[PDB]
Amino acid sequence: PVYVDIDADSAFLKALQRAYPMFEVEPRQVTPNDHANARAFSHLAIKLIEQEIDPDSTILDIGSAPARRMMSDRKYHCVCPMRSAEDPERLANYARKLASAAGKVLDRNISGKIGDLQAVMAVPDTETPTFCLHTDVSCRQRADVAIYQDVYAVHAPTSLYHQAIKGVRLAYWVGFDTTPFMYNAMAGAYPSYSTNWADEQVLKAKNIGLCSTDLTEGRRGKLSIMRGKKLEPCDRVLFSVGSTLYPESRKLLKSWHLPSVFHLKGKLSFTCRCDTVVSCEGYVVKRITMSPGLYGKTTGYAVTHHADGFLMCKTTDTVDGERVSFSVCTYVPATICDQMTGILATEVTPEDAQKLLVGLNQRNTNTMKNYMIPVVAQAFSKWAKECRKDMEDEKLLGVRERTLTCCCLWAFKKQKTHTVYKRPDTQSIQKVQAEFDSFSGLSIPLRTRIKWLL
Amino acid sequence: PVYVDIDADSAFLKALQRAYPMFEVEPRQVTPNDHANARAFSHLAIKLIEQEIDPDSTILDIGSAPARRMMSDRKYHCVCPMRSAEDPERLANYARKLASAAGKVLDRNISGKIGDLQAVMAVPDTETPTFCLHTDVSCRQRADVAIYQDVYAVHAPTSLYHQAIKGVRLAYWVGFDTTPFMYNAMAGAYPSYSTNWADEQVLKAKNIGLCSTDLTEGRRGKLSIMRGKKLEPCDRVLFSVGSTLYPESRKLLKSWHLPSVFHLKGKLSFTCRCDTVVSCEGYVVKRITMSPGLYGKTTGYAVTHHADGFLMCKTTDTVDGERVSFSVCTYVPATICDQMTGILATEVTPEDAQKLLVGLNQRNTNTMKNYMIPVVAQAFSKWAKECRKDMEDEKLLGVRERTLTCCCLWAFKKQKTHTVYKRPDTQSIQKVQAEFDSFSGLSIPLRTRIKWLL
Amino acid sequence: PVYVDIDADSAFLKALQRAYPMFEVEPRQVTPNDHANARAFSHLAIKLIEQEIDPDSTILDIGSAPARRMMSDRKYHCVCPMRSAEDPERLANYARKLASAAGKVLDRNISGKIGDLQAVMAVPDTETPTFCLHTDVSCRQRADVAIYQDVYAVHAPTSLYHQAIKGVRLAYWVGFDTTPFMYNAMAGAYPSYSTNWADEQVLKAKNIGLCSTDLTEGRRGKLSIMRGKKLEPCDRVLFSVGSTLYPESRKLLKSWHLPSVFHLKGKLSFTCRCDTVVSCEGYVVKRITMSPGLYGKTTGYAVTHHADGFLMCKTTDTVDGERVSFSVCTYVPATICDQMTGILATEVTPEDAQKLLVGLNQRNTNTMKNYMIPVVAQAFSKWAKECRKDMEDEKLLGVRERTLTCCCLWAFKKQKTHTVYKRPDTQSIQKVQAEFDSFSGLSIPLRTRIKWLL
Ligand SMILES: [Zn+2]
Ligand SMILES: [Zn+2]
Ligand SMILES: [Zn+2]
């Protein structure tokens, strides 16, 4: 069995048992994490990856803590770029966890890993079998499995190519579903994992998941130096997994939304596939295989299967007091989606839809988080309405009705789409890019401390 | 017994037991595939084919992975054209799966298949008894059974003739029902297999199965370089089986909708039959028999028996913002169809029809997927209405009412058919073509790696 | 007991036990065949014929596969004209089934049948005791029983005379009821066997059993080269038994609707009887007796006893978009017929009649297939109406009311009959013709195959 640190009466345990049928998932709650689900998923994700891959294979852990990786029989070789403030504490914790294992293991190469840390604290740029201080672009070790566990700040094709040229033929990416960022939403939620993310421009909104505003009477309106008149989603996004905050860029998030087939054509050439192997309510495990030489052709399309509904709607909020409208995305449980089918046959108001959603939810054992019921309600009310206007404005079969621009071009009226509702068992198809061909860090007071611990 | 990787409480298990009464189907879920049904069908399809065919026969596998085929007592000879990015990984996986079997089998010719891969990585163009790197038109092996398991990108008559000239007298094609492509629909669904397909022109539709659109206010309408005024189904189609995406061409799909009898008359002559041996909710197993010399005659008709209802309707969507109408097809469960019979005796609105369909579905144990209930509802409402207009516009028995074109020709008013509903136990009859008479790939870094694995 | 390949909970098993009281009918489903009923009838029909006929008799099998006939103790002599594409595969299958029986039988003349195929592939025109490559007109064997199992493409009097001059005194014809073709219907259904047939002119109808149409907006009406103005039933008809398609001609179908007595008087003379020995819901077994010399006289009448109701109505459809009306026939279960008796005492609308039929059917255990419920409903509503107009227009007893054509002839108004309803336990009486007096195929590449298999 596999023990997950979630409450025994948790409703996420069934979702987590479906996503992992090959395991016996048992709750062993030992810590009141506010993002316990996001970790109960990744623990099982590594448990599954370690079964799929060959035991005699060497694994590379990009941006991962070496502390969690030991006590495992797999030949891990963690690569620690030390790009953030957690890596020095991660290395301190690794050195400290090795000390309590000097003799009480004699099964997990502890006596080799102590030597491996002291030998890399002797020479920093060195390449040891199970530890190094390089970036994933800088490491010189040769393996055949790579694992990107919660690694979003990396450009996908560049890093994948740099792993492939080192002999990596299999790669696993455990992370959040990058689909809300291909639809290019402003703010969004992963409610089953207590995760909220927002574009920095709307961090002062009133009521979205990740926001914080102030009280006011609305009588100033004079402090605009330069007009915006344009509130598109910029590049910087902030994620809050429970209470843990991470900054990301939309570019490096969208880069991991890889197509089914792509080509990495640098000094060497590889043809690569990307398969979503696990998917639970917004948290995915993707499998990339890379093989030498160009084979086949690439369509440049990426598919997302929706097991649970996916909404993206236009919501009206007040960012920093100013009433704007932007796009918010969320995941709705497939049960709620299936039970709204009959009501969305007509035009329902957001009040009626919210009362019906609260009924379906409470029927204290909630199916979906309630902070998303208002917006979802509004989303449904818009969708059901835009479905009636499609029915009243029936066109002719196979014809269009373009209008001349009066010089040489044609014009067609665009309709206003306020909601994109991807029901369960539908798919999203996004045109992405394939055919990619365009591919220190530690102090002395720390280097003295990491080997003093051993 | 035969073990299928679907969960024990699945409702597809009963449908899968009906399609295979000669087996006892046991659920053995070990993986949360989002297209587990489409594979639980094909596993049993190969189990059935291997019983029907003679054990002393040689089998050819067009476009199939050699990995899955071993551990079978049948004399397989897989032909691997390496036409896509999966065949290199398929060969890597085959070479890796052979290594774990060097000695632990001594029953499935593992020690012969290792040498058989070594002999083809020594000479590429060689023809070995159980493996080759050719296409189906290029392979030179002589067998008597061919199997096309999920092989849609091949022209049926050409490939079948090239198998027949090599002594193949029996062929099996396991695939999706090619009937939605003879009615020439724009988009469609196989909802029991979580499969959606769409013509590339409508991949930016709002709400069909395989689509993805954006939010907008509909106030630009100026970017048409050249008018379309014509939205007929073009040749390129994209399939999403769960989350696995494949591109297909309507020509090569319609190619496999073979008639009951046809003739392959090239340098040699064969008379051939095509029998649908298995069909489950949109997934068929066809049996082609080929015999030397022309016998009988061909009427050129292809029949599809509908066990579950088949709808094709005109839906109004907004592709990339533009409100168009195109044809969508889907499969409706025979129970839903039978329970809709009484309501379709009059004119029902799509709202009433959708509420009634939701009632019949929920009566949490859904009979049909709900994302298809709206369109189906609309379809029914149109059909029930076009059935009343046939009754109000009663004609005379055996006469027509053509009108002179005023020169020498006659004119008859055509009526608008918005829905084609093929109820359970009806049949589709399509005029197709019979009488056919008009019939490398591997790199060095991979050929080095395949034999290093063994 | 006799084992039929139908599901254990099938509702056709009761009807099949009534049609064969002398047998123990046991369901042994081993194949998901879409026309399992049509074969569960014929298997029992041959079981019955083999009991009725004398064991020391020689049997002739017209157009039958020799493969199914062996393993039977009866002295069969199959005649294989090789008129279609199934006979070459039938012979391949026979040669293959003999090979698996060379030694494991020593009870069914396997060692004699192998030599009998080798002797006929040595000389083609030869006449061997249990196999020949002739037609039924060309075979020179002398027997005393003939069996026509699903043989519709043969002219009945000519074939029967050619069998009689060879000493055949008993003949059996297992087939579909040829009564819908004596009423000369355009399309029709045998719904208990999943069989639909249509005249080729209406294969593009919208909603009948065997058809397939397209979507359209009805705005072309310009492509008629020559007017029809006349939609009578032509000679070519297509049958779909489940999904198996056969073409037949109305002439050779009506040929087997033989009268109770007829005379075959050519170079020799025979007086012949035709009795329907078995009848199940549209599938009959007819027994023809032929004796030398002319005896008695012939009324030239053929009778059909209706155990289940038989409808033929005028339905309005749209063939290829053009709204026409033609005649469709179907079989209604005697229970549905009996339970509609009280409603048809007045004028019921097709909507009310369809809701009532759906009530009686569902009262998921359907009595009749639902795709025939609308048309049947309409049929009933017409019949019940034409029965009221007979009652309101009461004539005088034994008189007519002809009107002079003003020259020398008389005229009577003909009434419009839109429905012919033959209730259960009624009979149809048709004036047919009696007194009849107007009465290679294999290549080398196959003849090399057939004895190579043995
Ligand atoms: Zn390293
Ligand atoms: Zn080969
Ligand atoms: Zn003969």
- What gap in Å lies between CA A117 and CA A105, rounded to an integer? 17
- Cβ-proximal residues to A112 (8 Å cutoff; 6+ apart), any chain: A129, A130
- What gap in Å lies between CA C206 and CA B115, rounded to an integer? 59
Q: How far is the CA of B63 from the centre of ligand 2 (A)?
A: 12
Burial of B138 (0-12, 13-18, 19+ CB in 10 A): middle
> A-B interface: how many C-beta pairs under 8 angstroms?
246
> Could you tell me if C237 and C244 are in contact, meaning their C-beta atoms sit under 8 angstroms apart?
no
- What gap in Å lies between CA C283 and CA B130, rounded to an integer? 49
Q: What are phi and psi of B428, to 5 degrees?
A: -100, 135
> What residues does the ion ligand 3 have nearby, CB within 5 Å?
C 127, 132, 139, 141
- What gap in Å lies between CA B378 and CA B328, rounded to an integer? 11
- Cβ-proximal residues to A443 (8 Å cutoff; 6+ apart), any chain: none
B88:A307 CB<8 A: no
Residue B358 burial (CB count, 10 A): 23
Q: How far is the CA of C171 from the centre of ligand 3 (A)?
A: 16
> Could you tell me if A16 and A1 are in contact, meaning their C-beta atoms sit under 8 angstroms apart?
no
Q: How far is the CA of B445 from the centre of ligand 1 (A)?
A: 24
Task: List the one residue out of C406, C451, C407 whose CA is nearest residue C122.
Answer: C451
Amino acid at B29: Q
> Could you tell me if A325 and A316 are in contact, meaning their C-beta atoms sit under 8 angstroms apart?
yes
Residue C137: alpha-carbon gap to chain centroid: 22
- What gap in Å lies between CA B332 and CA B309, rounded to an integer? 5
Q: What are phi and psi of C352, to 5 degrees?
A: -60, -45
- What gap in Å lies between CA C249 and CA B96, rounded to an integer? 60
Q: Is C167 left (phi over 0), alpha (psi -120 to 50) or beta?
A: left
> Could you tell me if A342 and B355 are in contact, meaning their C-beta atoms sit under 8 angstroms apart?
yes
Documented resolution in Å: 2.9
Burial of B193 (0-12, 13-18, 19+ CB in 10 A): buried
- What gap in Å lies between CA B211 and CA A433, rounded to an integer? 18
- What gap in Å lies between CA B125 and CA C140, rounded to an integer? 55
By what technique were these coordinates determined? cryo-EM
Beta bridge partners of B417: C216
- What gap in Å lies between CA A195 and CA A382, rounded to an integer? 25
| Residues of chain B with a following break (C to N over 2.5 Å) | 363, 439
Q: For residue B371, what is the enclosing H or E element?
A: none
How many helices (H) and strands (E) would you count in chain B? 11, 21
Residue by residue, DSSP assigns C96-133 as HHHHTTTTT-SSS-HHHHHHHHHHHHHSTT---SSEE-
Amino acid at B268: L
Percentages helix, strand, coil for chain B (3-state, rounded to 5) are 30, 25, 45
- Which three-class secondary structure state does DSSP give residue A149? strand
Whether the CB of C443 is below 8 Å from some CB of chain B: the reply is yes
- What gap in Å lies between CA A48 and CA C384, rounded to an integer? 70
| Token pair belonging to C37 | 């009923």
Amino acid at A134: H
| Token pair belonging to B216 | 């907008």
Distances (CA, A) of A64 to A37, A70, A152, C143, C229: 19, 12, 12, 88, 81
- What gap in Å lies between CA B255 and CA B300, rounded to an integer? 13
Residues of C in contact with A396 (CB under 8 A): 217
Whether the CB of A394 is below 8 Å from some CB of chain B: the reply is yes
Ligand at minimal distance from the CA of B62 is 2
- What gap in Å lies between CA C29 and CA C33, rounded to an integer? 9
Q: Is A310 left (phi over 0), alpha (psi -120 to 50) or beta?
A: beta
> Could you tell me if B410 and B404 are in contact, meaning their C-beta atoms sit under 8 angstroms apart?
yes
Whether the CB of A410 is below 8 Å from some CB of chain B: the reply is yes
- What gap in Å lies between CA B310 and CA B282, rounded to an integer? 9
Distance from CA of B208 to the nearest CA of A (A): 8
Residue by residue, DSSP assigns B31-97 as S--TTHHHHHHHHHHHHHHHHHS-TTSEEEEET--HHHHTTSSSEEEEE----SSHHHHHHHHHHHH
Distances (CA, A) of B96 to A90, A395, B449: 36, 56, 10
Residues of B in contact with A261 (CB under 8 A): 84-85
DSSP C275: E
- What gap in Å lies between CA A199 and CA A180, rounded to an integer? 12
Kindly identify which residue of chain C lies nearest to residue B285, measuring between CA atoms: C32
Amino acid at A73: D
> Could you tell me if C78 and C65 are in contact, meaning their C-beta atoms sit under 8 angstroms apart?
yes
Q: For residue B390, what is the enclosing H or E element?
A: helix B373-392
Place of tokens 């907004």: B318
> Could you tell me if B94 and B86 are in contact, meaning their C-beta atoms sit under 8 angstroms apart?
no
Place of tokens 């709607």: A313
Task: Report the relative pairing of strands B322-332 and B403-404 from DSSP bridges.
Answer: unpaired
- What gap in Å lies between CA A270 and CA A426, rounded to an integer? 31
Residue A267 burial (CB count, 10 A): 7
How many residues in chain A?
454
- What gap in Å lies between CA A381 and CA A354, rounded to an integer? 9
Distances (CA, A) of A69 to A61, A76, A124, B42: 9, 7, 21, 39
Amino acid at B153: A
B316:A272 CB<8 A: no
Burial of C109 (0-12, 13-18, 19+ CB in 10 A): middle
Vertex C38 angle, CA C32 and C42, to 5°: 115
Q: For residue A199, what is the enclosing H or E element?
A: strand A195-199
- Which three-class secondary structure state does DSSP give residue C86? helix
Residue B325 has its nearest CB partner, among A183, A272, A395, at: A395
- What gap in Å lies between CA B252 and CA B154, rounded to an integer? 6
Residue B323 has its nearest CB partner, among A21, A169, A415, at: A415
Whether the CB of C228 is below 8 Å from some CB of chain B: the reply is yes
- What gap in Å lies between CA B428 and CA B21, rounded to an integer? 25
How far separated are the first and last CA of chain C, in Å rounded?
33
**Which chains does A contact via 3+ CB–CB distances below 8 A?**
B, C
Amino acid at B279: S
- Which three-class secondary structure state does DSSP give residue B389? helix
> Could you tell me if C162 and C137 are in contact, meaning their C-beta atoms sit under 8 angstroms apart?
yes
| Token pair belonging to B27 | 């659920």
Residues 339..378 of A with a Cβ closer than 8 Å to B: which? 339, 341-342, 344-346
- What gap in Å lies between CA B51 and CA B85, rounded to an integer? 32
Kindly identify which residue of chain C lies nearest to residue B346, measuring between CA atoms: C351
Distance from CA of C217 to the nearest CA of A (A): 7
Residue by residue, DSSP assigns A361-411 as HH----SS-GGGHHHHHHHHHHHHHHHHHHHHS---BT----EE-SSS-EE
Distances (CA, A) of C201 to A341, B206, C232, C407: 42, 40, 9, 40
> What residues does the ion ligand 2 have nearby, CB within 5 Å?
B 127, 132, 139, 141
What residue spans of B234-372 are helical by DSSP H?
250-254, 334-339, 350-362
Q: How far is the CA of C60 from the centre of ligand 3 (A)?
A: 8
- What gap in Å lies between CA C173 and CA C146, rounded to an integer? 9
Q: For residue C291, what is the enclosing H or E element?
A: strand C283-292
Q: How far is the CA of B167 from the centre of ligand 2 (A)?
A: 13
Whether the CB of C290 is below 8 Å from some CB of chain B: the reply is no
> Could you tell me if B63 and B83 are in contact, meaning their C-beta atoms sit under 8 angstroms apart?
yes
> Could you tell me if B368 and B332 are in contact, meaning their C-beta atoms sit under 8 angstroms apart?
yes
- What gap in Å lies between CA A126 and CA B57, rounded to an integer? 59
Whether the CB of C214 is below 8 Å from some CB of chain A: the reply is no
Q: Is B189 left (phi over 0), alpha (psi -120 to 50) or beta?
A: beta
| Residues of chain C with a following break (C to N over 2.5 Å) | 363, 439
Determine if residue A80 is labeled as part of a ligand binding site.
no
CA atoms within 13 A on the CB side of A239: 24
> Could you tell me if A7 and A27 are in contact, meaning their C-beta atoms sit under 8 angstroms apart?
yes
Distances (CA, A) of C79 to A31, A42, B375, C65, C117: 84, 71, 54, 9, 12
Instruction: List, as own/partner pairs, every contact residues B232-236 make where C-beta atoms lie below 8 angstroms and the sequence separation is at least 24, other chains included.
Output: B232/A398, B233/B184, B233/B185, B233/B186, B233/B199, B233/B201, B233/B326, B233/B327, B234/B199, B234/B200, B234/B201, B236/B199, B236/B200
- Cβ-proximal residues to C217 (8 Å cutoff; 6+ apart), any chain: A396, A397, B416
- What gap in Å lies between CA A105 and CA B156, rounded to an integer? 62
How far separated are the first and last CA of chain B, in Å rounded?
33
How many residues in chain C?
454
Distances (CA, A) of C318 to B392, C199, C228, C363, C402: 13, 14, 15, 32, 38
- Which three-class secondary structure state does DSSP give residue B449? helix
Residues of B in contact with C418 (CB under 8 A): 397
Task: Report the relative pairing of strands B403-404 and A75-79 from DSSP bridges.
Answer: unpaired
Ligand at minimal distance from the CA of C138 is 3
Residue B396 burial (CB count, 10 A): 13
- Cβ-proximal residues to C9 (8 Å cutoff; 6+ apart), any chain: none
Whether the CB of A16 is below 8 Å from some CB of chain B: the reply is no
Residues of A in contact with C220 (CB under 8 A): none
Place of tokens 């050719």: B134
Q: For residue B128, what is the enclosing H or E element?
A: none
Q: What are phi and psi of A430, to 5 degrees?
A: -120, 135
- Which three-class secondary structure state does DSSP give residue C55? coil
Tell whether the torsion through CA atoms of B203, B207, B208 and B211 is positive or negative. Answer: positive
A412:B244 CB<8 A: no
> Could you tell me if A154 and A403 are in contact, meaning their C-beta atoms sit under 8 angstroms apart?
no
DSSP B436: B
Residues of A in contact with C217 (CB under 8 A): 396-397
> Could you tell me if C175 and C150 are in contact, meaning their C-beta atoms sit under 8 angstroms apart?
yes
Residue A404 burial (CB count, 10 A): 11
Residue by residue, DSSP assigns B191-236 as GGGTEEEEEGGGTT-SSSSB-----B-S-----BSS--------SE
> Could you tell me if A453 and A95 are in contact, meaning their C-beta atoms sit under 8 angstroms apart?
yes
- What gap in Å lies between CA B175 and CA B190, rounded to an integer? 12
Determine if residue A127 is labeled as part of a ligand binding site.
yes
Q: Is A184 left (phi over 0), alpha (psi -120 to 50) or beta?
A: left
Place of tokens 């993707």: A286
Residue B62: alpha-carbon gap to chain centroid: 16
Distance from CA of B74 to the nearest CA of C (A): 18
Dmax (CA) of chain A = 85
Kindly identify which residue of chain A lies nearest to residue C219, measuring between CA atoms: A396
- What gap in Å lies between CA A163 and CA A171, rounded to an integer? 9
Whether the CB of B236 is below 8 Å from some CB of chain A: the reply is no
Strands, sheet with B75-79, edge to edge from the N-terminal-most edge strand = B131-132, B75-79, B58-62, B145-149, B170-176, B283-292, B269-280, B261-265
Residue by residue, DSSP assigns C197-221 as EEEGGGTT-SSSSB-----B-S---
Beta bridge partners of C62: C79
- Which three-class secondary structure state does DSSP give residue B253? helix
Burial of B140 (0-12, 13-18, 19+ CB in 10 A): exposed
Task: List the one residue out of B70, B55, B57, B141 whose CA is nearest residue B110.
Answer: B70
What residue spans of A22-177 are helical by DSSP H?
36-52, 66-69, 86-99, 110-122, 156-164
Instruction: Please list the active-site residues of B.
Output: 35
| Token pair belonging to B320 | 């990339």
Angle, in degrees to the nearest 10, between helices B444-452 and B86-99: 20
Whether the CB of C216 is below 8 Å from some CB of chain A: the reply is yes
- Cβ-proximal residues to A190 (8 Å cutoff; 6+ apart), any chain: A176, A177, A196, A197, A281, A282, A283, A331
A338:B364 CB<8 A: yes
DSSP A186: S
Ligand at minimal distance from the CA of C78 is 3
Residue B207: alpha-carbon gap to chain centroid: 23
Angle, in degrees to the nearest 10, between helices A350-362 and A373-392: 130
Task: List the one residue out of B449, B92, B85 whose CA is nearest residue A270.
Answer: B85
- What gap in Å lies between CA B202 and CA B187, rounded to an integer? 8
Place of tokens 């008894």: B129
Amino acid at B363: R
